[PDB]
Design a protein around this ligand. Sequence first.
Ligand SMILES: NS(=O)(=O)c1ccc(Nc2cc(NC3CCCCC3)nc3ncnn23)cc1
Length: 292
Amino acid sequence: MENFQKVEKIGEGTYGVVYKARNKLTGEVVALKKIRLVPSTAIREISLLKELNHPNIVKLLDVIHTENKLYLVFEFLHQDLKKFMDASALTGIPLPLIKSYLFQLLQGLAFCHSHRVLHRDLKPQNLLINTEGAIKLADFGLARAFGVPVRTYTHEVVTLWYRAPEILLGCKYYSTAVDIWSLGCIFAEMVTRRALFPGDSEIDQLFRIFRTLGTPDEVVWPGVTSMPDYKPSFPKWARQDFSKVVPPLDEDGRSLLSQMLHYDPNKRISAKAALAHPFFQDVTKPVPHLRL
Ligand SMILES: NS(=O)(=O)c1ccc(Nc2cc(NC3CCCCC3)nc3ncnn23)cc1
């Protein structure tokens, strides 16, 4: 910790405060994350993450385990997708830039998923951008290390907006499909400039999904009626057209989004298969208009 000068609070993450900081010796600019107090399994899990290197994954530079305290040192990025989306709202992020960001996030997911590491808590706040037109996933793997809480250390409510239905229905065993669901939610949000499912409680989240995608049943999702928090008494809404859900997304994008939002996690498209979807045929890498 004391090898680092704090520059500014960037905010409060799921686990603790996050600071922009400078390495007092080398002068590296980093994101310094203090983790709420560790358990030996967390230590070993976190150490696995240090090897999990990819250009679309925010690089974990160091784990500092001293003073019976936990600090993670990450590559610093200057802006998140929430801020960029807010700043891009009058016109929306251009479609070629949305496609580039999606394509790159799918490459980051395909990499981590191939090593059997899930994120489990994707959201615009942990998708980070640079001036070179890259986008990167932050906090990959931390959920398995530390366990997603209802509120943060400072009592902020953790979003349910990107949570997959199998989590909301109480499944204990998450697959990589939960990441594809979240990213599909984020895809829809970039295109429409509104969150797809802005739930404010678990049942509101579920019922918003149900109203857009149809109440899931045994036809679309074998095994659904036997999940822990499924209730026979759930209302039965009908599905709406994607044409109505994500205008003005084109037929390729609407097709891909449908596959990312399949109820059954076993039918949901994988990151690798999604990279091959015709939506990405004409993918490019534009430079974003970034004000820092
Ligand atoms: N709000 S902002 O666009 O100015 C912004 C967003 C992210 C960062 N950087 C950042 C932020 C971050 N965590 C965010 C979690 C949600 C609260 C804000 C900090 N983790 C990071 N890892 C590497 N960089 N980095 C800096 C500015």
